[PDB]
Design a protein around this ligand. Structure first.
Ligand SMILES: Cc1cc2nc3c(=O)[nH]c(=O)nc-3n(C[C@H](O)[C@H](O)[C@H](O)COP(=O)(O)O)c2cc1C
Ligand SMILES: Cc1cc2nc3c(=O)[nH]c(=O)nc-3n(C[C@H](O)[C@H](O)[C@H](O)CO)c2cc1C
Ligand code: SF4
Ligand code: SF4
Ligand code: SF4
Ligand code: SF4
Ligand code: SF4
Ligand code: SF4
Ligand code: SF4
Ligand code: SF4
Ligand code: SF4
Ligand code: SF4
Ligand code: FES
Ligand code: NA
Ligand code: NA
Ligand code: NA
Ligand code: NA
Ligand code: NA
Ligand code: NA
Ligand code: NA
Lengths: 318, 196, 207, 443, 333, 191
């Protein structure tokens, strides 16, 4: 009298192997070499800060998921990505509580007030960075980036570039590798490591060539049209990390190819404008945020044609 | 039995700041201290009382096609007299709130209450309505100003709390730091209203 | 034909829609003017009172003050090579028992973060700075409004011989050097430029 | 022969586990001892029984009478005695009126069956009458009547007939065996359909993982210049009657207009083989090919089996269960239907029996959408599945309708590629059902 | 002082007069909108955007008047009194209606009607209907995923621990949002004073239904022979009660063998509970009305009648000329 | 060159809504759909463009050579109120009657705080006729761009799981704060 007790559902009955956790772990694997370079250059305090941020992010998320009566989905490795990318945007002379405050702002307000993962329209890490720069400008400006053991440098390359002191700037090979006196954010100095990680992410099928290629091309053309050096503008600042890792966020980018092209062109234009005629030495974060704001307008004009229909000339509702 | 209900609608049931969400520009502009909000609320309440009584005393001869010019004429006269007196006797408050004292004539609460309650009621009810709305406006402004000032300056009513080594959150006293704060407050009220 | 000859009464209802509005406006005017007649001049008094305080706190002494006929102000502005005119507002001379004590000068410099500031200063007979103050500003209350505080006190003691330079550093180095507020440098540069132009005016006048 | 190539835009690449049963020979089922024949083996109006309990029937004798125009007759698969005209469990989950026949052991043929004729003297009217008389429906899966399909309305014009040989679902092999074994019958059925409609053009489209079938069809066609063979890239939604038309002819079916408005008549290869066989012999449709495979089957194979045999008899003939199953599916993995019991008989549109184990039948719970955008990239109709699913999940039918939810072909590709393991196609089906229902109660 | 008073008065007065005359002229030529009879029915509506409508809102319902494009009694939620208030602006109407509540015709709770298989997917009734109709053994019963609770706007449905919905009679306002949202056609509208309801929707024969559920209908027809008012009929192998002809006699309740008919036997027994004030010893009820229940001699007031029988239908409460008979339900419990 | 710079500063660098806290109530009121935002923007543009010239003429032809500078606010608001009354008369007749969905914010155009504000700014900055017209047009265009972007973001957020208690006004205020930070990126530019 044995029964069967089968399962009934809807089609399909097979799935693919990839999931969210695999994608996030691959992003962490891609970000590892920049962490190695930062630890080699800046020392043991560069790693510890990173750890602090990660811990804070995870803790914050769990607490909210316990109070709102929701399943605790902390094993998809997304808060880890947010914490690492936030820690990469800090100087070496920052206190321990700045990372805690930034992580709490990034997780509690930007992400979890809108629904959770994928339900927001803005970048958490860049918004937290802008909030930190506005609230505490003395801990985030132009002196916190130079190590206390060095007393000859006294300026980062973008500040010297904007002031016309080109002769005291580091070499272009040094700016490409980041190994002979290049200072800035801990996870931005080396462009070779970020390029390697971005190529690995492109090979795996997680991102595409469009956004980084068009970003860098627009920056180079803008620099060439006004009589400047394109390579120096590309290998200095935080434009490689933004191009390969931060402008390619899933929740704040268009889903079509044409929208992505327009998005990248606008990002490059606003970045170069703020760099040349603005009140900041860099304009990557604000350009990406401003293109995040304009994304829902781009998406309604750049959708593909549907199989079947052959266009209606705005006369079906008259 | 009817005066008290109109007086107490006011602060809680129909708060202009927390329920109707009106008069947002001075609310988000001047609430960087606990002193500015009180003075703004008091001046607005005086103007509201005068305008409501004056408009309700003339709801028999004003035609429906020229009502807005008459309303704004009365409100502007009251605002001008109040501003002249405040310039004569209180220069510090006038200097602190320089541009929004001439802008009391356009406050989204005086004109809204003029065409919703004063145009169809008597003198006794309009006075109570104006008093209640002014009290609610003043209370909300004082609460928001205190909350913003404590975080963004480290002091309450000019009295320091955390010492001389405190480093304030300078975004709270900035235009982006008002919006978020107010939103959170309203959410809290909702969580204590439908759940209770 | 006025939309097919509206029947007579359609114009009479126009008249009653004008006259009432007319009288309302008249009544409003009949209030406001009267209030002006009892207020405006009094307000003016308050203004000059505050002004005299600015003329007494900057230069602490028991003396009298005299004002130029403002033609010499324009003559000084025209000469010396002032690139931007109309930036010098009032110059006063302090007299005590005949001997010249100093000059008090008000200047409005542009090139701030939010526009134009108003800076008043006072210079003794031998070139020194006895204190500066800010009369009117429109900076951020938490970022640029800190110039009318402790930062104003350090201007005393400087000689009126050379210009002043601002550094973005805690160390004050040596002579004729100004340390700015952290996170606020444009306001400090504007105030220093106004002080420098006052120093130049005093140097030209006292020769 | 000149073999051209074709492809379409979009789609997925499943593992295609067909290598298990492709090299095994073809099996033949044993003589059944009991058959259950339902009264609804098509779409349209069900038949009416014309037999009683205790009656004696022949092989090929009709046991059900058509009601209207969109209705086909129903015949008997064995010769025996009627034991029940009650209602019995069906593959749709409910109970349907059926006729139960117990076999006699002898296959006595009804003494009224004779060959219809030859190709040179049958013409269109008698061809259509013969197709209706034998109860032939569409063996591609939808079981639409064929005689209705061959009647073109006077306000429509067609010029080509295309055979669907691009078998695309995984685990399925029966069409490959049929094309490699009985190519001449396929060609004859194509010619008969062309004469019935009245056109002078014919195409056959086969995927390129079945090259031996392509050579067999090319050799069978011969010197005829009106027939062509195409090779198509191996993809999943390639064979869905619309991508096939776009790949072979380059045209597109309009928005809600059926293939007849593009001038094409699409037919399966098994239907053409059945047409040729019924013309040559004079016998109705009572037998077809099946693939019994899966993870819980001891000896998977492709086997020829009569209509009315239960699923459990086929499973017992194919070795049995190696382990306790977790899922039994009628069809393929991408579009099949899961069953409750194993008393279900096989029907005219049943192409496979797929049994999965408990480990292979497990899928994780759905999670939050992460806005990756792969569903937008895999859709062959170029829709946006995420927005339709999110609108359907909160009962917004106007936004679902304005986002073109009624032209989804329900292929399942969007639900296969989701990393968050969402239930997109089911939500789109809910939205379509609600829109169709609202079109009736408000009009 | 004369000029400083005179000049601003003249300037402001001229400005106001010119603006007033201009606006008065612009009242003509431009917009007149020719829309008379200001709504006056939105105040008599009380509307909360409930859903027994489909004209775009209650305000548009007030604004769509004087075109004659809408029915007078279009809104059923408010009732006939609300319709009278709405159309009383014009008048010439009067009426009344009967209050109703939602009910569930099913009593199979997750142990008397268990599940055939296991279901995977989202916990919704229509989503479960996509998966070949569900996994319950009975193909006509409740799925238990609360779609009706999800579509309710007044928060009147809760889902019990046994898997069946429960409706609060004090929060339900006589609409049909849950009626057309149920995929099983299970939610219905029943008068609030009705207590005798057949709770089943099974259209199978006796043996299959008996195997499916504990309290299924086997279509025996024993309830039809008990009723003498022709109010309960068996069709499609299931019984149903007409609430217009039901006198609530509580006979079919006792006659059912599978306990499908709701209500408890506590009824009637008031055979000629006659008030002595307004009967003239007519003695017309002693002869016959279907039971004997009255027999005696002349019956001068006060009436001497023993009460042990009769069914308490209620026709005798009204058919009397003076209506001296009073009905009081007085039994055990 | 001055006109282009003044337009650029009015639209981007010195936006009236996201910097100066002026048009907030209709920003939070009628930004639920993209179709209503465009009509509100064009009405606002018409009102500001017509008001700037009349206020300039009245101030520089009557108020200045008469010593009646204390009558600025009442005269300006009288002109603005008459213009808004005329626009309210026009809209229900010629413009679609289904656009009377503002339902409180149409008579509150006089209270928008950006018409009187831009008039006072034009008077205080000592401009000319063309400069005043360009400033008014730039302010109106900035208002329109901000409200269209807000409406688009809200339409995107319509498919998100805002929990149960924040919803409309709190989520609108948080969104406005985030956009205000993004535009706080536009600071320190000298034109
Ligand atoms: C996703 C999908 C895949 C299909 N795959 C096939 C297929 O591989 N072979 C086939 O003959 N029909 C397939 N069909 C059915 C066709 O759309 C079409 O109904 C069929 O060619 C008609 O054949 P008939 O005329 O013999 O009924 C598929 C349909 C869909 C929606
Ligand atoms: C390709 C990729 C890029 C990401 N970029 C960011 C980023 O720049 N900042 C961030 O906080 N999270 C980032 N995340 C992770 C983050 O949890 C998620 O994408 C959403 O932004 C969270 O709603 C990224 C994730 C992926 C897969
Ligand atoms: S099931 Fe529908 S929506 Fe999904 S990929 Fe196929 S056609 Fe597109
Ligand atoms: S594939 Fe899934 S997770 Fe990715 S966008 Fe589509 S629905 Fe969202
Ligand atoms: S049913 Fe009546 S009350 Fe409810 S929304 Fe419709 S008109 Fe309004
Ligand atoms: S009554 Fe209908 S909608 Fe409600 S839970 Fe039962 S089956 Fe679902
Ligand atoms: S229970 Fe049904 S009828 Fe009653 S209020 Fe809710 S949806 Fe309306
Ligand atoms: S048999 Fe009747 S009571 Fe039992 S589950 Fe089915 S419908 Fe409900
Ligand atoms: S007595 Fe009960 S079981 Fe029999 S028909 Fe009536 S309701 Fe059904
Ligand atoms: S309660 Fe009485 S009247 Fe009603 S159905 Fe049962 S027997 Fe008939
Ligand atoms: S009036 Fe009624 S109670 Fe009296 S005798 Fe007649 S039937 Fe009986
Ligand atoms: S009329 Fe009915 S209730 Fe009254 S006595 Fe006769 S049987 Fe009983
Ligand atoms: S628009 Fe400024 S108070 Fe409303
Ligand atoms: Na402000
Ligand atoms: Na004033
Ligand atoms: Na104001
Ligand atoms: Na209003
Ligand atoms: Na702002
Ligand atoms: Na508002
Ligand atoms: Na800003």
């Amino acid at each position: 009298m044995n029964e069967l007790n089968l399962t009934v559902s809807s089609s399909p009955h097979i799935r693919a192997k990839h999931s969210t956790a695999s994608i996030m772990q691959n992003v962490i694997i891609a970000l590892l070499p920049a962490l190695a370079v930062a630890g080699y250059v800046f020392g043991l305090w560069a790693l510890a800060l990173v750890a602090i941020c990660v811990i804070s992010s995870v803790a914050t998320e769990a607490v909210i998921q316990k109070l709102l009566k929701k399943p605790i989905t902390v094993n998809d490795w997304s808060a880890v990505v947010t914490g690492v990318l936030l820690a990469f945007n800090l100087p070496i002379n920052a206190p321990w509580w700045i990372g805690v405050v930034g992580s709490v702002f990034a997780i509690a307000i930007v992400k979890q007030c809108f629904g959770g993962l994928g339900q927001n329209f803005i970048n958490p890490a860049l918004a937290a960075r802008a909030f930190l720069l506005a609230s505490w400008p003395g801990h985030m400006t132009s002196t916190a980036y130079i190590p206390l053991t060095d007393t000859v440098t006294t300026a980062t390359p973008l500040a010297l570039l904007k002031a016309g002191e080109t002769g005291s700037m580091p070499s272009t090979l040094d700016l490409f590798t980041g190994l002979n006196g290049v200072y800035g954010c801990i996870g931005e100095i080396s462009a070779l490591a970020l390029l390697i990680g971005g190529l690995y992410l492109i090979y795996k099928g997680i991102i595409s060539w469009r956004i980084p290629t068009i970003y860098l091309l627009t920056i180079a053309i803008f620099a060439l049209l006004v009589g400047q050096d394109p390579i120096v503008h590309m290998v200095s600042g935080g434009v490689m990390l933004g191009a390969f890792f931060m402008a390619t966020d899933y929740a704040s980018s268009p889903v079509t190819a044409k929208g992505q092209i327009i998005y990248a062109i606008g990002c490059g234009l606003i970045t170069m404008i703020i760099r040349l005629y603005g009140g900041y030495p860099e304009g990557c974060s604000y350009s990406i945020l401003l293109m995040n704001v304009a994304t829902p307008l781009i998406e309604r004009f750049t959708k593909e044609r549907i199989y079947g229909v052959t266009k209606i000339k705005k006369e079906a509702k008259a | 039995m009817n005066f008290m209900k109109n007086l107490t609608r006011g602060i809680i049931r129909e708060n202009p700041t927390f329920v109707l969400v009106l008069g947002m520009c001075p609310t988000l502009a001047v609430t960087t201290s606990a002193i500015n909000g009180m003075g703004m609320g008091l001046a607005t309440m005086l103007v509201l009382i005068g305008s409501n009584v004056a408009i309700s005393a003339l709801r028999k001869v004003i035609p429906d096609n020229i009502r807005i010019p008459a309303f704004v004429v009365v409100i502007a006269s009251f605002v001008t007299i109040v501003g002249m007196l405040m310039k004569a006797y209180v220069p510090a408050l006038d200097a602190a709130l320089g541009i929004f004292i001439p802008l009391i004539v356009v406050n989204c609460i005086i004109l809204a209450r003029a065409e919703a309650f004063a145009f169809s009621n008597g003198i006794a009810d309009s006075f109570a309505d104006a008093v209640g709305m002014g009290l609610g406006f003043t209370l909300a402004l004082t609460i928001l100003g205190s909350i913003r000032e404590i975080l963004g300056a480290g002091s309450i009513f000019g009295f320091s709390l955390f010492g001389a080594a405190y480093e304030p959150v300078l975004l709270m006293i900035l235009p982006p730091g008002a919006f978020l704060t107010l939103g959170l407050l309203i959410g809290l009220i909702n969580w204590k209203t439908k759940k209770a | 034909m006025e939309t097919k000859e509206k029947v007579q009464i359609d114009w009479k209802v126009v008249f009653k829609l004008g006259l009432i509005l007319f009288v309302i406006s008249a009544v409003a005017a009949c209030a406001l003017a009267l209030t002006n007649y009892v207020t405006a001049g009094t307000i003016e008094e308050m203004n000059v009172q505050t002004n005299t305080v600015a003329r007494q706190e900057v230069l602490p002494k028991a003396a009298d003050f005299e004002a130029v006929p403002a033609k010499d102000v324009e003559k000084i502005a025209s000469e010396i090579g002032m690139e931007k005119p109309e930036e010098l507002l009032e110059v006063y001379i302090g007299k005590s028992n005949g001997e010249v004590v100093g000059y008090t000068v008000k200047t409005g410099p542009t090139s701030g973060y939010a526009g134009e500031v108003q800076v008043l200063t006072g210079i003794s007979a031998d070139g020194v700075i006895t204190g500066i103050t800010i009369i009117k500003s429109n900076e951020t209350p938490g970022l640029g409004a800190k110039a009318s505080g402790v930062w104003n006190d350090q201007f005393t003691g400087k000689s009126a011989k050379e210009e002043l330079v601002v550094v973005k550093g805690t160390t004050k180095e040596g002579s004729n050097e100004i340390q700015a507020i952290t996170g606020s440098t444009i306001t400090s540069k504007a105030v220093t430029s106004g002080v420098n132009m006052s120093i130049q005016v005093y140097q030209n006048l006292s020769k | 022969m000149n073999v051209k190539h074709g492809t379409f835009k979009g789609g997925i690449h499943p593992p295609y586990r067909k290598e298990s049963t492709a090299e095994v020979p073809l099996g033949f089922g044993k003589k059944p001892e009991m058959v259950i024949i339902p009264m609804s083996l098509h779409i349209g109006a069900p038949c009416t029984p014309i037999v009683k309990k205790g009656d004696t029937v022949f092989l090929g004798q009709r046991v059900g009478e058509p009601n209207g125009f969109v209705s086909v007759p129903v015949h008997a698969s064995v010769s025996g005695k009627v034991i029940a005209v009650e209602e019995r469990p069906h593959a749709s989950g409910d109970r349907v009126m059926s006729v139960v026949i117990e076999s006699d052991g002898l296959d006595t043929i009804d003494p009224s069956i004779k060959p219809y004729g030859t190709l040179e003297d049958m013409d269109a009217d008698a061809i259509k009458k013969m197709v209706l008389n034998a109860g032939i429906v569409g063996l591609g899966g939808a079981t639409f009547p064929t005689h209705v399909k061959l009647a073109i309305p006077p306000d429509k014009k067609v010029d080509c007939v295309v055979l669907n040989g691009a078998e695309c679902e995984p685990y399925l092999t029966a069409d490959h065996h049929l094309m490699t074994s009985q190519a001449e019958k396929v060609v004859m059925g194509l010619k008969l359909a062309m004469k019935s409609v009245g056109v002078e053009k014919g195409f056959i489209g086969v995927e390129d993982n079945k090259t031996d079938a392509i050579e067999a069809l090319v050799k069978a066609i011969g010197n005829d210049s009106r027939l062509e063979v195409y090779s198509l890239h191996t993809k999943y939604p390639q064979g869905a009657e619309k991508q096939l038309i776009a790949a072979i002819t380059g045209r597109e079916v309009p928005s809600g207009a059926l293939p007849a408005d593009a001038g094409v008549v699409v037919m399966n290869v098994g239907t053409a083989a059945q047409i040729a066989e019924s013309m040559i012999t004079g016998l109705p449709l009572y037998k077809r090919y099946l693939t019994c495979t899966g993870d819980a089957i001891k000896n998977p194979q492709t086997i020829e089996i009569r209509i009315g045999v239960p699923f459990q008899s086929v499973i017992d003939q194919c070795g049995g269960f190696s382990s306790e199953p977790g899922k039994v599916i009628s069809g393929g993995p991408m579009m099949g239907v899961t069953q409750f019991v194993t008393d279900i008989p096989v029907m005219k549109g049943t192409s496979g029996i797929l049994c999965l184990t408990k480990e292979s039948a497990k899928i994780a719970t759905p999670s939050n959408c992460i806005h990756c955008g792969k569903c937008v990239g895999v859709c062959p109709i170029h829709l946006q599945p995420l927005n339709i699913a999110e609108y359907s999940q909160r009962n917004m039918w106007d936004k679902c309708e304005s986002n073109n939810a009624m032209d989804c072909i329900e292929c399942g590709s969007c639900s296969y590629i989701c990393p968050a393991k969402r239930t997109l196609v089911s939500s789109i089906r809910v939205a379509k059902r609600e829109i169709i229902a609202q079109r009736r109660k408000g009009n | 002082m004369l000029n400083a008073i005179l000049v601003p008065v003249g300037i402001l007065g001229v400005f106001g007069l010119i603006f007033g005359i201009g606006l008065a002229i612009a009242a003509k030529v431009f917009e007149v909108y020719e829309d008379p009879r200001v709504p006056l029915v939105r105040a008599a509506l009380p509307g909360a955007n409930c859903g027994g409508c489909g004209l775009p809102g209650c305000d548009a319902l007030a604004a769509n008047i004087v075109g004659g494009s809408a029915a007078i009694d279009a809104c059923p939620v408010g009732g006939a009194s609300c319709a009278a208030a709405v159309a009383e602006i014009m008048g010439m109407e009067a009426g009344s209606a009967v209050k109703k509540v939602a009910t569930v015709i099913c009593q199979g709770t997750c142990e008397t009607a268990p599940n055939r298989a296991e279901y995977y997917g989202e916990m919704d009734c229509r989503e479960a209907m996509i998966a070949s109709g569900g996994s319950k053994g009975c193909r006509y019963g409740c799925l238990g995923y609360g779609t009706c609770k999800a579509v309710c706007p007044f928060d009147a449905i809760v889902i019990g621990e046994d898997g069946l919905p429960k409706v609060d009679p004090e929060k339900c306002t006589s609409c049909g949002k849950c009626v057309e949202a149920c995929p099983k056609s299970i939610m219905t509208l029943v008068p609030e004073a009705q207590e005798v309801i057949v709770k089943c929707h099974n259209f199978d024969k006796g043996k299959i239904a008996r195997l499916s559920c504990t309290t299924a209908c086997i279509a025996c027809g024993a309830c039809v022979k008990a009723c003498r008012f022709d109010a309960i009929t068996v069709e499609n192998n299931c019984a149903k009660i007409d609430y217009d002809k039901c006198r609530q006699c509580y006979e079919c309740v006792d006659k059912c063998p599978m306990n499908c008919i709701s209500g408890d036997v506590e009824y009637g027994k008031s055979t000629a509970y006659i008030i002595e004030e307004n009967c003239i010893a007519c003695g017309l009820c002693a002869k016959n009305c279907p039971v004997n229940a009255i027999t005696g001699e002349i019956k001068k007031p006060p009436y001497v009648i023993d009460h042990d029988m009769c069914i308490g239908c209620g026709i005798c409460f009204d058919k009397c000329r003076k209506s001296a008979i009073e009905m009081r339900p007085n039994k055990t419990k | 060159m001055t006109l282009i710079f003044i337009m650029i500063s009015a639209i981007f660098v010195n936006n009236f809504v996201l910097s100066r806290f002026l048009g907030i109530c209709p920003f939070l009121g009628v930004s639920k759909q993209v179709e209503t935002a465009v009509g509100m923007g064009v009405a606002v543009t018409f009102v500001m463009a017509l008001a700037s010239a009349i206020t300039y003429v009245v101030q520089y032809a009557i108020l200045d050579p008469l010593s009646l500078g204390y009558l600025q606010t009442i005269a300006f608001i009288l002109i603005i109120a008459a213009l808004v009354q005329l626009v309210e008369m026009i809209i229900k007749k010629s413009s679609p009657s289904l656009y009377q969905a503002l339902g409180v914010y149409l008579p509150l155009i006089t209270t928008n705080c950006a018409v009187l504000g831009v008039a006072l700014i034009n008077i205080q900055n000592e401009y000319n006729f063309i400069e005043t017209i360009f400033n008014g047009v730039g302010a109106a265009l900035g208002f329109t761009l901000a409200i269209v972007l807000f409406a688009g973001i809200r339409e995107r957020l319509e498919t998100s799981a805002v929990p149960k208690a924040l919803e409309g006004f709190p989520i609108a205020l948080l969104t406005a704060g985030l956009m205000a930070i993004a535009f706080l990126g536009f600071s320190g530019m000298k034109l």
